Symmetry: C2
Subunit: 245 residues, 2 copies
């Protein structure tokens, strides 16, 4: 710090590495990270090495810098120092991986940043690999979910589901499902001159064709077993068409 | 006509039947029908009997009245009198059946009126029983077609076809078809990271998923075998949704 050299780092950080060595050959590293003074003695005079620090709430902070000034590995622990909370790995080339762990020392969440600026954001992860997913792309977002084998991001339009699957090892594969909406059916009763229309095991309408040469609609209650209202006579084509929706 | 009695008739007609009998016991009938004087001698003094006449173009007109004043059967022939053109039967109770015949002495067309005021209108009839159909109902019209067995009147709304079938002997029966529109399918090429979308054996779009983490649409020509345009990149969700329609 005193008369030393400023080194820029992956992820908008600096370190100050001492101009000269110490008693045991080391170089002094000081970095203000987040807002803590972090400190450490390193074999090398470039910026590489570990820096440690303690938050005012007694959480332990450990910043590792990779030998080639490539990779800053920012770990946060619980007060004991044994129990990992969070971990931001940044890479040389602008890409980062913000993790989070749970009570058990198991990964809860994961924000992946990509070199371009696009993101994979996993949350609510569970013991059996599964959880939410978001993909931040340039201009728009693909939501989805996670499993042990794969991420699946989905986009829907009416009867079409587009499904972008990203495998564990990076492999994209895409698929499409068009599935028709539930269709009307009907049954004719010759006895009563009544068409009863069934949608998805729910009766919906009675269309009745009278000896008086006219047509009457009545609606099934949303139970789909008893009629409701009273019988509405038809007065032009349009109404018959309406009943068929 | 001279000093006789006016009888009203089925189908807005009158006849004048003579007050007294003739030489051979008959009663004189005169009717102005359409605009012809029609004439005939009848056994009975009520209005019943036949009346004949000749149009100025030499077509022969034959009006029959049923004994009970029930039914007026207006036939028109060709000039020869043997070859039927048209035939309007009216009934007592306001119902009528306007036929038409063809060159061969076979029925071409048929307007059925019903007592209520509703109509069945068959046209363009053919040797194998078939032809157009219209049903004039109170407030609206059901179009359709004819066969030897049956009339079929159809009403459509999107994927639904309502079909009212009237059998030879009057029997109504109704049916419904909901049939889903042609659905998208797609094939993935791992080689090129391209989804190709097929609608009804016609390729429609290429969706391409780039190593650059972006999506590009290109359209198939309406042949459904070669691409067209050039590859349009995607810029928000909405566009991806659009491609799925």
């Amino acid at each position: 710090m005193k008369n030393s050299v400023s080194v820029d780092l992956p992820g908008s950080m600096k370190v100050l590495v001492s101009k000269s060595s110490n008693a045991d050959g080391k170089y002094d590293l000081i970095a203000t990270v987040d807002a803590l003074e972090l400190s450490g003695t390193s074999d090398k005079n470039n910026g590489s090495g570990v820096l440690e620090g303690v938050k005012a709430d007694a959480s332990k902070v450990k910043l590792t810098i990779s030998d080639d000034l490539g990779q800053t590995t920012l770990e946060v622990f619980k007060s004991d120092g044994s129990t990992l909370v969070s971990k931001k790995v940044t890479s040389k080339d602008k890409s980062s991986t913000e993790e989070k762990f749970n009570e058990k020392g198991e990964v809860s969440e994961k924000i992946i940043t990509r070199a371009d600026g696009t993101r994979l954001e996993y949350t609510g992860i569970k013991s059996d690999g599964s959880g939410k997913a978001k993909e931040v792309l340039k201009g728009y977002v693909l939501e989805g979910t996670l499993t042990a084998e794969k991420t699946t991001l989905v986009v829907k339009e009416g009867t079409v589901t587009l499904s972008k699957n990203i495998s564990k090892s990076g492999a994209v594969s895409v698929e499409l499902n068009d599935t028709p909406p539930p269709k009307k059916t009907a049954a004719w009763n010759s006895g009563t001159s009544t068409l009863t229309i069934t949608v998805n095991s729910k009766k919906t309408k009675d269309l009745v064709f009278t000896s008086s040469n006219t047509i009457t609609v009545q609606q099934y209650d949303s139970n789909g077993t008893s009629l409701e209202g009273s019988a509405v006579e038809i007065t032009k084509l349009d109404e018959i068409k309406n009943a068929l929706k």
